[PDB]
Amino acid sequence: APPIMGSSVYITVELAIAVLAILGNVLVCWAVWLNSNLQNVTNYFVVSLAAADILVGVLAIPFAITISTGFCAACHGCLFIACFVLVLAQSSIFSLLAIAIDRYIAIAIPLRYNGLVTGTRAAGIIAICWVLSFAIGLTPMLGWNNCGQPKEGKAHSQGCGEGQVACLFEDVVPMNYMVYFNFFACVLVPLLLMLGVYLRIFAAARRQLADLEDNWETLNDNLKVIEKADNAAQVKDALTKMRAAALDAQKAHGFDILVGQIDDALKLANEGKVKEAQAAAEQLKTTRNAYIQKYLERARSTLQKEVHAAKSAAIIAGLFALCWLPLHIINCFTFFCPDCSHAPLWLMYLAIVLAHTNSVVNPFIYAYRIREFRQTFRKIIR
Ligand SMILES: CC(C)CCC[C@@H](C)[C@H]1CC[C@H]2[C@@H]3CC=C4C[C@@H](O)CC[C@]4(C)[C@H]3CC[C@]12C
Ligand SMILES: CC(C)CCC[C@@H](C)[C@H]1CC[C@H]2[C@@H]3CC=C4C[C@@H](O)CC[C@]4(C)[C@H]3CC[C@]12C
Ligand SMILES: CC(C)CCC[C@@H](C)[C@H]1CC[C@H]2[C@@H]3CC=C4C[C@@H](O)CC[C@]4(C)[C@H]3CC[C@]12C
Ligand SMILES: Nc1nc(NCCc2ccc(O)cc2)nc2nc(-c3ccco3)nn12
Numbered sequence: 001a002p003p004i005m006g007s008s009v010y011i012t013v014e015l016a017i018a019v020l021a022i023l024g025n026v027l028v029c030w031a032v033w034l035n036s037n038l039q040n041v042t043n044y045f046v047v048s049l050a051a052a053d054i055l056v057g058v059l060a061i062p063f064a065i066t067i068s069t070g071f072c073a074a075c076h077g078c079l080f081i082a083c084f085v086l087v088l089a090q091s092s093i094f095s096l097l098a099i100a101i102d103r104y105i106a107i108a109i110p111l112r113y114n115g116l117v118t119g120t121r122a123a124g125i126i127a128i129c130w131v132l133s134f135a136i137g138l139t140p141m142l143g144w145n146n147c148g149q150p151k152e153g154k155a156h157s158q159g160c161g162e163g164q165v166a167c168l169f170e171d172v173v174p175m176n177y178m179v180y181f182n183f184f185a186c187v188l189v190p191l192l193l194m195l196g197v198y199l200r201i202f203a204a205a206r207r208q209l210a211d212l213e214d215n216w217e218t219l220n221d222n223l224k225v226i227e228k229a230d231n232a233a234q235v236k237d238a239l240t241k242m243r244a245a246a247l248d249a250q251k252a253h254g255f256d257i258l259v260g261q262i263d264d265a266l267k268l269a270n271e272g273k274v275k276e277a278q279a280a281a282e283q284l285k286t287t288r289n290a291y292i293q294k295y296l297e298r299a300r301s302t303l304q305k306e307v308h309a310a311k312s313a314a315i316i317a318g319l320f321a322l323c324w325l326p327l328h329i330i331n332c333f334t335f336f337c338p339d340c341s342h343a344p345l346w347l348m349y350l351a352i353v354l355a356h357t358n359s360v361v362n363p364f365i366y367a368y369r370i371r372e373f374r375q376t377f378r379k380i381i382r
């Protein structure tokens, strides 16, 4: 029963989280700094996210411990302590959304990617996102707060001085802000947009892969057609099919040998020399073994690497949602069901701890899923 015992557990757990969030995310920043292979726009958003998680350990967690005491404070000071974590969560959402878009450009418009997506533009986007996060997270300080309706019975019972309140989250931060503005508009909508981006990434990868396969099968089918010695009409028609595919494959080294060899055979076939056109087409089986098989396999593995990277990013976004959703959902109960008894205090604190735990997990996901990070972590730890 004595409040200090339960508080001791919660504070201890918070501090353990803070240590881990600081240490793992410092390692992330260190790895990007040290390894030029990791210096790319995608990972500038990774660093912005790690910076947000570092600040969860250095500031948000000390603020959360502080506000759990209900200490007397000027209400607007209390608001800052209460809301600063919403800045960090918002910055995390922007960084996650940026990463998802980045991976979409990369898989969907790779020709243009490095042209569109530069480190200087990325740095500007990150600055903007941080500014917007401050404005979203600290909106209660602009007047959308309960500071005009203080709980004077709590204030008095705690001994607070004139004009102070007991600094408690749900006393000062309006739930309509938390539910409608923060959760629905600022969190859930970005998360649904993120989900839509990832679904478009995986559909674009699957489509490009199937086209690689279709274009390859077309080459091989049209060859068997030619060997089914029909008319010059046939050979011609199969070679035209092959040439088109060959450009879809190229347009999308030895493609010149390939298209030349097709053109050579097309001339023979357009001149009614079926057997020499057939003989001419058989040289294709060699250019295909020596060049086109190789281009296909490399294109396949480049794709898979990008699917792999996109899944890693999606995992991080999904873990952000898992960790933060319980708090938002509880707030919905508090707001929408005044007839419901309030979620109990142990559960509130469990949900807070769970949200903070999100700031620990990304460095593990990078180490398990991204060899360049893992390898750089290892060398740093030495
Ligand atoms: C660069 C970093 C380390 C700066 C951190 C500054 C933090 C700790 C400062 C900045 C603003 C400060 C708050 C400003 C106003 C008040 C109201 C007062 O009645 C109680 C203290 C309280 C709630 C302060 C607590 C400490 C505070 C949150
Ligand atoms: C440490 C370097 C990098 C930055 C400087 C941070 C300084 C200015 C911060 C760190 C901790 C802060 C203090 C934390 C707590 C309180 C109690 C509050 O009732 C009044 C403000 C006061 C006294 C803060 C004043 C500003 C403060 C001293
Ligand atoms: C892990 C993620 C994906 C889902 C988590 C769902 C959690 C947050 C849900 C599942 C069951 C829910 C509880 C069901 C019943 C009540 C009683 C009500 O008087 C207050 C809210 C409270 C206590 C709910 C709080 C939120 C709750 C704990
Ligand atoms: N509802 C809520 N409460 C708290 N702390 C107060 C927990 C509490 C709730 C009731 C009470 O009588 C005493 C303490 N922090 C909170 N943080 C958040 C939050 C951040 C992001 C989404 O929700 N919600 N939230």
Ligand SMILES: CCCCCCCC/C=C\CCCCCCCC(=O)O
Binding pocket: 044, 045, 047, 048, 051, 059, 126, 130
């Ligand atoms: C009292 C709270 C305010 C004082 C504490 C410091 C506030 C820090 C605010 C914003 C930090 C933004 C850092 C973003 C790092 C970007 C990483 C990158 O360059 O890719």
Ligand SMILES: CCCCCCCC/C=C\CCCCCCCC(=O)O
Binding pocket: none
């Ligand atoms: C961030 C690096 C700089 C060092 C941080 C400064 C250290 C401040 C840490 C804790 C502040 C403790 C405030 C509580 C004491 C006041 C209690 C009271 O008498 O009412």
Ligand SMILES: CCCCCCCC/C=C\CCCCCCCC(=O)O
Binding pocket: 058, 059, 062, 063, 066, 071, 072, 073
């Ligand atoms: C290397 C140091 C790492 C830890 C730094 C922690 C910085 C402390 C940040 C916020 C503490 C805020 C506590 C406010 C106490 C208010 C007390 C009062 O108003 O009476």
Ligand code: NA
Binding pocket: 049, 052, 053, 088, 089, 092, 358, 359
């Ligand atoms: Na985060």
